[model samples]
Target: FDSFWFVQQWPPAVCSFQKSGSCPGSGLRTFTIHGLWPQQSGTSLTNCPGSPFDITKISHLQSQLNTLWPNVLRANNQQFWSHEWTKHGTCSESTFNQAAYFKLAVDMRNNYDIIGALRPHAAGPNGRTKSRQAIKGFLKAKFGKFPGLRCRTDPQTKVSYLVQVVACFAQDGSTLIDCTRDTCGANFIF
Candidate 1:
């Protein structure tokens, strides 16, 4: 309820593409929806904590959702959507219905191209190492906030890489805001 962690995950960038996170064009070309998580200190945040939603009802949006928010693990895509809806979508129970929650995530993905936001910066997508400061500054300049830059180490290479860009929003889910979990490094891959 306080913030929504909309994580845009890049598998190849994270170095877990071949096994853990796999899909056609998951990492190199573009990012994929990891999930939209609802975060806050609350007692009722149980699994599947919202009203039942017939995802089939929104059949029209499936194509667009699939394009902007395809599951990294694609075969079981519906399961992923269902899981996101049950966990994160319900967090919006105080302010949004299931349809509205899914719609918003889709809209955010379509409207806000975080990659594009970072393109002009040195720490952008030039396949170069960049300091955490440059990225922080770029995001602040483009999105009006310092979003989280997540990392993950490859088991094979034993090297760390940029995994996800977690953009957070206010309780109302209208505007970007400084994220509490701003874990990143001065020297990291893009």
Candidate 2:
């Protein structure tokens, strides 16, 4: 594995499972950008030192950031920022500064481009479900690598669904790498 884990999530799946304030029904729903995590082996570093969270630093990206990576946990606002940046962003600051961190993630999200990639394979919405086989195949074919899928099952209904898409990349930004984590077998969730 490289130096990063690009974690993206489906907000509706999160809200249905958690039933918490993190993903409120009142909030805008979409495929959310969870965080660009910094990883090594199968583990991730947290609480690393770097520039503290400063709202002024991202002043220019506010409008776009609000919609792209909103904090469904806390008013789609700064709490998510405080958590993601303080935890993972600090470690990445070793590369550069705040802009470097944010820009890197934006680029990564765009490159992964799941929305565009999946359009040919499955309907991506709450009422629709796609098989794990198709999702894995299409992603691997489109991205030239196997991207990880995160699955969740409902306790009451036992209905399995996709909650996240985890992609790994090397620190030097060469190519997608394999994860040393446990295998996922939710073979029928989109």
Residues 1-190, candidate 2, lDDT per residue (tens digit)?
Answer: 2468788887767677765445552344457689988876578888887778988888887776777777655574777887889988887786747877776777777778786788766545545667766777777888887787887878888777787888778885446876434244645355
Model 2: how far is 170 from its true place, Å?
0.8
Backbone clash numbers for all candidates listed: 0, 3
Instruction: Tell me the alpha-carbon RMSD of every candidate.
Output: 2.8, 2.5
Cα misplacement distance, residue 76 of candidate 1 (Å): 3.0
Best by lDDT: 2
For candidate 1, the per-residue lDDT at 36 reads: 76
Pairs that collide, model 2:
22-72, 22-73, 71-76
Q: Please provide, for model 1 over 1-190, each residue's C-alpha lDDT reduced to its tens digit, 9 standing for 90 to 100.
A: 5678888887566444457544554544787787777777622243645676577756778987777776665557677788777766776777877777777788878766877887765455655677777877788888788878887766777655787888888777778878767556666777
lDDT of each prediction vs. the true structure?
A: 0.71, 0.72
Q: For candidate 2, give the lDDT.
A: 0.72
Cα TM-score per model: 0.85, 0.85
